[PDB]
Amino acid sequence: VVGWHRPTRLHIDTQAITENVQKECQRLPEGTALFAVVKANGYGHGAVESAKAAKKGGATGFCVALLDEAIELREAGVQDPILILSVVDLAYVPLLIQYDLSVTVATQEWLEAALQQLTPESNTPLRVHLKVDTGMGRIGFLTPEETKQAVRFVQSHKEFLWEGIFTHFSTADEIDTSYFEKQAGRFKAVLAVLEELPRYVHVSNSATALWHPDVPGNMIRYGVAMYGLNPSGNKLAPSYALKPALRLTSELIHVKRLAAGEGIGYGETYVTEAEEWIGTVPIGYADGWLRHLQGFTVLVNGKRCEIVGRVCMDQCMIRLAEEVPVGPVVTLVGKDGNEENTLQMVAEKLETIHYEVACTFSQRIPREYN
């Protein structure tokens, strides 16, 4: 299940994770907390290690997207608050108590149904965070009144404890700020009809924390920035230099001299124009190195090489500058000489964002930590 017996490898610089986190904490008021969102296996970097690295930088809470992803954190030994970011089935409400997990709620219907199968006055309250939809449009309460009604209800039952209320931004990372503020208005107006306020009032994410610090709240969910990736993609400049924590390498496992007019790859989409030194790298699209990456250039001995021909499930072919033996290290993501390949670079070639590139990296790729 994990390709340990193949030179293809992912190196993760956890120190970066800590640095990126520390620096952000230094820009936060003494009252603002920093929760490290490590869902989807730390954006493909590794949950536990990201969490562990995250903590050492000031992290005092973590966010995940699944119940069992949290259990893994609990199991891994993290004893800090863990916030599951999306809705969770009622059948699994007991698991939330057993692991003292914090859950997000978006319907009055959920709470009422949860209220049942919950002891009258449990010695273990259910930590709820109310999600308000102020523009994202995926989950949350749409109305200040509903929001408020939700609160009144959670407040009127000791079997609950709402440690939070929050919302999420859909365009924090954009130059035009108009929609952003409209979302903030919707949040203010829904907090506005509230008497009390929980311990956690969060609204910002990586993008928000960087280009909209003034935004209210005593807690922030730091994501991609943790891994040193500009949230805006390329649109704006982070408030501080982010250190990249993802590195991907492999090596040549076959070298060859091809005559002119030899086709390489499926459907022979490529044909030699002349004498060409072609290298065979053991990484395919099943590893995450997608087919549309064809044409992209990777690194070897500090020189760029083009991926020629169709990328395969388990390998691909690159045009080597000059003869070379089997064994030279192939840098796909990272620095090598003067050349460097950023996930942003991979992303732009893939016409997506690095959030996706990173997750797409299969488990078949062993990850090594500094």
Ligand X SMILES: Cc1ncc(COP(=O)(O)O)c(CNC2CONC2=O)c1O
Tell me which residues in 336-365 interact with a second copy (CB under 8 A). 351-353, 355-356, 359-360, 362-364
Query: Is there a contact between 318 and 279 (Cβ–Cβ < 8 Å)?
Result: yes
Q: Which residue in this structure is represented by tokens 């290298």?
A: 279
Pairing outcome for strands 339-341 and 329-336: antiparallel
Q: Which of residues 203-222 bind a second copy (CB under 8 A)?
A: none
CA distance 184 to 196: 19
231 binds, among a second copy, ligand X, none (CB under 5 to 8 A by kind): ligand X
Residue 227 annotated as binding site: no
CB of 115 to a second copy, least distance (A): 17
Decide if 39 is catalytic. yes
Q: Which of 39, 52, 131, 148 is catalytic?
A: 39
206 binds, among ligand X, a second copy, none (CB under 5 to 8 A by kind): ligand X
Choose one: 151-159, 274-282, 297-305, 328-336; the region binding a second copy (CB under 8 A): 274-282
Q: In the beta sheet, which residues pair with residue 318?
A: 279, 307
Is position 169 an interface residue for ligand X (rule: CB under 6 A)?
no
Residue 362 annotated as binding site: no
Query: Is there a contact between 319 and 278 (Cβ–Cβ < 8 Å)?
Result: yes
Residue 231 Ramachandran class (φ > 0 left, ψ -120 to 50 alpha, else beta): alpha
Q: Which of residues 49-68 bind a second copy (CB under 8 A)?
A: 65-68
Q: Which of residues 121-150 bind a second copy (CB under 8 A)?
A: 133, 135-139, 142
Is position 6 an interface residue for a second copy (rule: CB under 8 A)?
yes
Longest dimension (CA), the chain: 80
For a second copy, what does the binding mask look like between residues 146 and 185, x meaning CB under 8 A? ------------------------xx--x----x------
CA distance 181 to 75: 39
- CB-wise, 32 or 280, nearer to a second copy? 280
302 binds, among a second copy, ligand X, none (CB under 5 to 8 A by kind): none
Residue 313 annotated as binding site: yes
Among 263, 295, 302, 337, binds a second copy (CB under 8 A): 263
Is position 231 an interface residue for ligand X (rule: CB under 6 A)?
yes
100 binds, among ligand X, a second copy, none (CB under 5 to 8 A by kind): none
192 binds, among a second copy, ligand X, none (CB under 5 to 8 A by kind): none
Q: Which residue in this structure is represented by tokens 């993501």?
A: 333
DSSP, collapsed to helix, strand or coil, labels residue 66 as coil
CA distance 305 to 234: 24
Is position 72 an interface residue for a second copy (rule: CB under 8 A)?
yes
Q: To 10 degrees, what angle do helices 67-75 and 47-55 make?
A: 60
Is position 76 an interface residue for a second copy (rule: CB under 8 A)?
no
179 binds, among ligand X, a second copy, none (CB under 5 to 8 A by kind): a second copy
CA dihedral 243, 81, 207, 249 (to 10 degrees): 30
**Tokens read off for 85:** 């970011």
How crowded is residue 260: how many other Cβ atoms within 10 Å of its Cβ? 10
DSSP, collapsed to helix, strand or coil, labels residue 185 as helix
Residue 324 annotated as binding site: no
- CB-wise, 222 or 355, nearer to a second copy? 355
Radius of gyration of the chain (CA): 24
Among 17, 38, 242, 290, binds a second copy (CB under 8 A): 290
Q: Which of residues 308-367 bind ligand X (CB under 6 A)?
A: 312-314, 355
Sign of the torsion formed by the C-alpha atoms of 344, 350, 356 and 358: negative
Amino acid at 218: N
Which residues touch 274 (CB under 8 Å, ≥6 apart)? Answer: 260
Residue 217 annotated as binding site: no
- How far is CA 70 from its chain centroid? 15
Binding site residue list for substrate:
138, 313
Positions annotated as catalytic residues are 39, 266
Binding site residue list for pyridoxal 5'-phosphate:
43, 206, 221, 223-224, 355
Interface residues with ligand X (CB under 6 A) are 37, 85, 168, 205-207, 221, 223-224, 231, 312-314, 355
